[PDB]
Design a binder for this molecule. Structure first.
Ligand SMILES: Nc1nc2c(ncn2[C@@H]2O[C@H](COP(=O)(O)OP(=O)(O)O)[C@@H](O)[C@H]2O)c(=O)[nH]1
Ligand SMILES: [Mg+2]
Length: 655
């Protein structure tokens, strides 16, 4: 019942509103008549990996490219290859995943198969190949002509319940032959047996044509193009056939690659009997059974009721039950092998992105272990305590499913501060909270998580001598604070020596420092990358207390940071801007205006991918300015790289 050769992990992707959901639903319908939904067609298992809701979900998208094997790009046949279409395309190119295209909405007014073919050629340099011609134009669209097999199909209704293989109507008869000749030509580019025949004017075997087009599609050399109307149930069954005919099995594509703890890259091969290696890519919380953590098995076998090792951490996780999600029901399975996908129940310490392995297998990691330094802060204020109550709750819960964000209570304001990887991250989170959790609050505008730090050693003291509330308080500390190498964080060294400061308070003076670091002097942002050494001070036999030293520590640090030629530190993003050749130095000047630094340009497909360093504070509304200069065709990804000292000029302003 299992056989790689007949597995087919795909993922539908299209410009928003083009027809991804409908196309997927119609697939499940047709295959159904007998995060990752499975189904069968012509003796083949199709695992429809669920691609991110929108291309902007960059991280999610790249991960889904690695989790799927083949793709079906859906275009609105009346719009052609739109901006996002281009975006997903670049993505598909980046992960070299074979693909086929589907011209959807052929039934709609303005729908044109040639607009999709031409724009695919033009914008994407896709080298499409006409796999079929339509019958009827708009509301009169009624049939599809397979031009590889020279046969037509007409549809009795808009319900996908009356399909009839009629011969090609004389009226498109010539066009079919024209494209069939053209289709044979393309196939000859991948098979000499066919090239010979083509030249001979001979007719190659369907099995021959189908295999060469497949070879080509999987070699990233061509893109079969099919058409239809998802909503009007036309062409979907023909699309299901294309999937099996031309889309790759876990054996047709190069193996996924992973890194061992030794930093050594490795090719993980799709060997069911080899050591297990799987990726968890979507942690969902199903109503009955709790959290389903979806995984892609790359090699080896995942067994039900067993132990897998989480290399992205270091503990044995327990896979309770394994299920395959079908269109209208769940199915418990005894195991999932190489090239397959499913949802494992259990696994409480495993989060999306982690790697699970054989427990007696190499400890490879399919993804980086690094963590997204929170670079965007957004304040939230529940509106009624009742909303406040279910807010921090929704957070605790949502915090486990995704730990790439941190929450804090702003020092002075006392406000709740959610921090993420970028405006978008925070956007989906915030949204998720008002919807899934129906928590309504006032959400502040996103800002960059600046940090503060000194740039020269200082030796200061903190005294807190006061008759506070009747009794006297006395705290005296003398610390030496010096700058730590960027990224070292915090270090407290207690060099105290003669009971000079009663041990009873050492931790208390640290508590004071930790708190006065929650707000630098320049802009009241966190102080980081500093070494603090308490070496002297004094106490009052009766007047001292944990509080006096606590405050004494707070004072000492405010003093130390204000005196050490403090400097503001801003996040520096690593930006990859994929753009059409034409708008080249055009986009390069903008990034330089954003105080950027280009690191080079290495082409992708028929487009140019520019790599650069740009300060996050300069990326606000970049998505817009970009499309403003790449005439809507450009796009880009962005990641945190390092923290940097803001320029002399920049500083004087932020202050
Ligand atoms: N006329 C027509 N409408 C379609 C077709 N496919 C999808 N739609 C409609 O277009 C809208 C967006 O489609 P949907 O699949 O949700 O787009 P998605 O954002 O790509 O998932 C919905 O109103 C669909 O019913 C099609 O072939 N023809
Ligand atoms: Mg949708």
């Amino acid at each position: 019942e299992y056989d790689l050769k007949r597995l087919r992990n795909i993922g539908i992707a299209a410009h928003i509103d083009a027809g991804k959901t409908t196309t997927t639903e119609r697939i499940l319908y047709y295959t159904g008549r007998i995060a990752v939904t499975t189904c069968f067609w012509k003796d083949h298992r199709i695992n429809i990996i669920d691609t991110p809701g929108h291309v902007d979900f960059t991280i999610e998208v790249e991960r889904s490219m690695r989790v799927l094997d083949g793709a079906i790009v859906v275009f609105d046949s009346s719009q052609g290859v739109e901006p996002q279409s281009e975006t997903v395309w670049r993505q598909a190119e980046k992960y070299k995943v074979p693909r086929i295209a589907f011209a959807n909405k052929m039934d709609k007014t303005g729908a044109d198969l040639w607009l999709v073919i031409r724009t695919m050629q033009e914008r994407l340099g896709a080298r499409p190949v006409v796999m079929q011609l339509p019958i009827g134009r708009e509301d009169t669209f009624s049939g599809i002509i397979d031009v590889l097999r020279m046969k037509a199909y007409t549809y009795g209704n808009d319900l996908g319940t009356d399909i009839r293989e009629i011969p090609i109507p004389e009226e498109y008869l010539d066009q079919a032959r024209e494209y069939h000749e053209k289709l044979v030509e393309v196939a000859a580019d991948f098979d000499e047996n066919i090239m010979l025949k083509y030249l001979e004017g001979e007719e190659p075997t369907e099995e021959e044509l189908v295999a060469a087009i497949r070879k080509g599609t999987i070699d990233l050399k061509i893109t079969p193009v099919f058409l239809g109307s998802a909503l009007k149930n036309k062409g979907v069954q023909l699309l299901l056939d294309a999937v099996v005919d031309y889309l790759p099995s876990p054996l047709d594509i190069p193996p996924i690659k992973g890194t061992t703890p030794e930093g050594e890259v490795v090719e993980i091969h799709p060997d069911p009997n080899g050591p297990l290696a799987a990726l968890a890519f979507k942690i969902m919380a199903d109503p009955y059974v709790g959290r389903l953590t979806f995984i892609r098995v790359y090699s080896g076998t995942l067994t039900s009721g067993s132990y897998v090792y989480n290399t992205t951490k270091g503990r044995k996780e327990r896979v309770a039950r394994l299920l395959r999600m079908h269109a209208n029901h769940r199915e418990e399975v005894e195991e999932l092998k190489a090239g397959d996908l499913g949802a494992v129940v259990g696994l409480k310490e495993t989060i999306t992105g982690d790697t699970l392995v054989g427990e007696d297998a190499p400890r490879v990691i399919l993804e980086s272990i690094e963590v997204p330094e929170p670079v965007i802060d957004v304040a939230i204020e529940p509106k009624t305590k009742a909303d406040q109550e279910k807010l921090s709750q929704a957070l605790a819960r949502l915090a486990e499913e995704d730990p790439t964000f941190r929450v804090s209570t702003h020092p002075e304001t006392g406000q709740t501060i959610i921090s993420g990887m970028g405006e978008l991250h925070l956007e989906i989170i915030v949204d998720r909270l008002k919807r899934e959790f129906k928590v309504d609050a006032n959400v502040g505008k996103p800002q960059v998580a600046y940090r503060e730090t000194i740039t020269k050693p200082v030796d200061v003291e903190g005294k807190f001598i006061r008759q506070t509330g009747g009794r006297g308080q006395y705290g005296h500390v003398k610390i030496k604070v010096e700058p730590l190498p960027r990224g070292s964080g915090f270090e407290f060294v207690n060099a105290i020596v003669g009971g000079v400061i009663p041990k009873e308070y050492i931790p208390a003076v640290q508590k004071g420092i930790e708190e006065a670091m929650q707000s630098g002097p320049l802009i009241g942002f966190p102080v980081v990358d500093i070494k603090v050494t308490l070496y002297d001070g004094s106490y009052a036999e009766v007047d001292s207390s944990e509080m006096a030293f606590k405050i004494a520590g707070s004072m000492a640090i405010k003093e130390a940071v204000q005196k050490g030629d403090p400097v503001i530190l801003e996040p520096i993003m690593r930006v990859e801007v994929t753009t059409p050749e034409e708008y080249m130095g055009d986009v390069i000047g903008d990034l330089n205006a954003r105080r950027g630094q280009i690191l080079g340009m290495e082409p992708r497909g028929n487009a140019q991918v520019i790599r650069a360093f740009v300060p996050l504070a300069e990326m606000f509304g970049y998505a817009t300015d970009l499309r403003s200069k790449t005439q809507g065709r450009g796009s880009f990804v962005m990641f945190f790289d390092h923290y940097q000292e803001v320029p002399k000029q920049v500083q004087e302003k932020l202050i």
